[PDB]
Amino acid sequence: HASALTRSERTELRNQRGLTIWLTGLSASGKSTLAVELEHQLVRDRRVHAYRLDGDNIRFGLNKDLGFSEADRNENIRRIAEVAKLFADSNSIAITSFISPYRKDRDTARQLHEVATPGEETGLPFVEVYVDVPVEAPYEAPANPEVHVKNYELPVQDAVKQIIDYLDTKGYLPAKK
Amino acid sequence: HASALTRSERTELRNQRGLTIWLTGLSASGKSTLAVELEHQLVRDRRVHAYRLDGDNIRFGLNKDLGFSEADRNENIRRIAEVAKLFADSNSIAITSFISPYRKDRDTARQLHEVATPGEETGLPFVEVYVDVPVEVAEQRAPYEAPANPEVHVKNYELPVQDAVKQIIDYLDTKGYLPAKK
Predict the structure, then answer these.
(1) Which fold has domain B1-182?
(2) Residues in chain A whose beta carbon is closer than 8 A to a beta carbon of chain B?
(3) What Enzyme Commission number(s) apply to this enzyme (chain A)?
(4) Which CATH architecture has domain A1-177?
């Protein structure tokens, strides 16, 4: 009644942890396709609440006021990161493949997630997924992604299993059925 | 799964509809309190996904660049409405009691929600809850504009929190927004 739901309670009641999965890679890497299949399997096959922050739903709605100066490019990433963090706070798995060529773009989102919230003394997981393709605004590959997917002749279903299995190694999901 | 997850499929899989509950009323109407309890009950008692978009997490996070400007006030409201729409799109119940004194304020938020989303020929439910207390009662500590026609009208004067919340949730049920109680 008095004070709001704590992270323990919500996690307990929601039966899944909250986090953000950020798929990074070249525009042609197929990262967007993986995000879609990833959200689908998480919600359908694993029964959790997950949500893909789609580039265009974001641009046409929350970030419609933003253009293309460098400050606006940074602001787009900042708002999407704060929104992902809110989904993570609600014990949902936020997913995004929003354009972000530079390491500093993802590091900034990562840093906002690590910054604690009155929901604890801890931040929320940020899982950077490098969707790597044969190279066969200069994109900067991440230095240490939580997940590295070599998306060459790889069924999308296997690419996504790779991501989900990594989630299971951290205990972010409830066991399947 | 090529063009994957539609509202219908997500609704079916999340087992609850997604929507936004906007609690409007005077600053001292007790609306913030109801938002907290409402989130608790929906999440705990109804076993559903709900999230309160009130608080410092927003004021010092997504909206940390906004102040008391009238333009900032309007932008605060616009962003919260868009973020609530995202939660509703995800089949969650977004909850907010953010300051929005005018009908135009909530009408702006409602408009975004009722606007047909990509793929669907429909918007998402926008539930405007009037947490009604008389002005003199609020003042017991540019004028607020009560909604013309709110989905829920809570006569909150000396009304217990549980009763207000129950009235909101029962309304949600008359709509089927929620899954049957456990």
Answers:
(1) Rossmann fold (3.40.50)
(2) 1-5, 9-10, 13-14, 36-37, 39-40, 43-44, 47, 49, 51-53, 56-57, 61-62, 65, 79, 82-83, 85-87, 89-92, 112, 117-119, 156
(3) 2.7.1.25
(4) 3-Layer(aba) Sandwich (3.40)
